[PDB]
């Protein structure tokens, strides 16, 4: 299959260099933003197979930052892009909220290579490795 | 804070690799695949400097960068650096390269120790050993 389009979203720069070097020696082509602000900006431009939104950022947390795509989506007239969630450790209340702002689907930090792998082919089809 | 840089073109492999070897030298690195998009990410984030492909349709580098200086002027924003690579570019080339906006260049065959005397001598950052 083709290589996966990713956009990694997360405000902490070593974490986001981690997990855009996972997936870019899985053979994914991944675009690395720094700001749920970024993320709206890009995903207007790009796109992409998939986002993994980091749900902790300041100004435009996650959740912000998938309401402000969604609404751009239908506005726009767009076809929706997956959008995975990269939490800490999320009770029930928390991923209902998340799945509440639009988002599809979550995976709980630290992320490792076999959930994102799992994460891309449930949502797009494409596999990664 | 280290050094933030853009890399631009629009053949995924040579993004990656050129990305890779600015990443290797501590640099914070975005990697875009278009003039149009250049553009963009100039307007939302600073980077030090710019290394932007030259060959891309419907904008080319020389146009990314007119568009990137024409910005700059009007939003009045601290210009950036903007660096061609080039295949194996003809002396016309070269020069048309600088009457764009485009500040130097360096051929295909790059490497870390390369880009890092770029990133030094027109950014005055240090990268690499030296970050």
């Not at 956009?7 to 020696?25: G, H, K, M, R």
């Not at 950022?57 to 998938?66: E, H, L």
Request: charged share 25%.
């Amino acid at each position: 299959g083709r290589p996966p389009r990713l956009l990694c979203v997360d405000d902490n720069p070593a974490n986001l260099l981690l997990v855009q070097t996972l997936l870019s020696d899985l053979g994914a082509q991944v675009t690395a933003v720094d700001s749920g602000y970024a993320a709206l900006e890009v995903v207007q431009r790009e796109r992409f197979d998939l986002v993994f939104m980091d749900v902790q950022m300041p100004g435009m947390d996650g959740r912000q930052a998938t309401e402000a795509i969604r609404r751009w989506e239908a506005e726009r007239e767009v076809s929706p892009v997956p959008v995975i969630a990269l939490t800490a450790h999320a009770l029930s209340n928390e991923k209902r909220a998340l799945l509440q702002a639009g988002m599809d689907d979550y995976l709980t930090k630290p992320i490792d290579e076999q959930q994102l792998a799992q994460v891309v082919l449930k949502w797009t089809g494409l596999s990664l490795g």
